[PDB]
Amino acid sequence: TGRDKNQVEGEVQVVSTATQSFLATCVNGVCWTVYHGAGSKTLAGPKGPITQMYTNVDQDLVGWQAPPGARSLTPCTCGSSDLYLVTRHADVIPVRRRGDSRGSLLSPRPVSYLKGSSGGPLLCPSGHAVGIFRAAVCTRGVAKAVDFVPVESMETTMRASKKKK
Ligand SMILES: [Zn+2]
């Protein structure tokens, strides 16, 4: 079921697929990344291409089966929305969630800098992942608001991995 070797111990893992590179946040023992970047799965685990377990195309999301290769952050809805997002490498900025699919980036920046920041996570002020960046709202040439996938959508995969048959 994928390579999944070498201890990851990382809340967010940067990877690259046949189309591009972006981010994936481990949540509830499930690595979640952005569908508009993975496509035909086969990304890069700790050391080898891993296969995806589920894919919410209607929601543009894909969740793998992370186990001993992921720290997995805590979901928790959090009444407070002072979240924090990290870019492909770091960029720790505070974003106030404006909805389950929207967050207000307190620090506007050129959307080009957010290229690959999608698939990351908006962590509550306590270290709880509740939103994975899905799209940047760029006005003149900088994102003035971040759109992201809801963690509640990850729970549906946990209830049943697609279950087509
Ligand atoms: Zn939380």
Q: Which of 116, 119, 120, 131 is catalytic?
A: 116
Instruction: Calculate how far, in angstroms, residue 69's C-alpha sits from the geometric centre of ligand 1.
Output: 22
Q: Which of 4, 63, 118, 119 is catalytic?
A: 118
Give all domains of the chain, ordered by start, each with its CATH number: 1-73 (2.40.10.120), 74-158 (2.40.10.10)
For residues 127 and 59, give the distance between their C-alpha atoms in angstroms, rounded to a whole number: 24
Query: Is 89 among the catalytic positions?
Result: no
Instruction: Calculate how far, in angstroms, residue 165's C-alpha sits from the geometric centre of ligand 1.
Output: 34
Residue in this structure with the two tokens 């908006």, named with its chain if needed: 122
Encoded tokens for 10:
């990382």
DSSP-based three-state secondary structure for 111: helix
DSSP assignment of 33-95 equals EEHHHHSS-----SSS----SEEEGGGTEEE---STT---B-----S--EEEE--SS---EEE
Instruction: Calculate how far, in angstroms, residue 131's C-alpha sits from the geometric centre of ligand 1.
Output: 10
Residue in this structure with the two tokens 């023992």, named with its chain if needed: 29
Query: Is 58 among the catalytic positions?
Result: no
Contacts for 152 with CB less than 8 Å, ≥ 6 apart: 100
Residue 20 near residue 42, CB atoms below 8 Å: no
Residue 149 near residue 134, CB atoms below 8 Å: yes
Q: Which of 60, 103, 117, 128 is catalytic?
A: 60
Instruction: Calculate how far, in angstroms, residue 27's C-alpha sits from the geometric centre of ligand 1.
Output: 11
Encoded tokens for 102:
């929207």
Q: Which letter, b or e, does each residue of 35-68 get, where b requires 16 or more Cβ atoms within 10 Å of its Cβ?
A: bbbbeebebebbeeebebbbbbeebbbbbbbbee
Query: Is 118 among the catalytic positions?
Result: yes
26 is an annotated ligand-binding site residue = no
138 is an annotated ligand-binding site residue = no
- Solving technique for this entry? NMR
Query: Is 116 among the catalytic positions?
Result: yes
31 is an annotated ligand-binding site residue = no
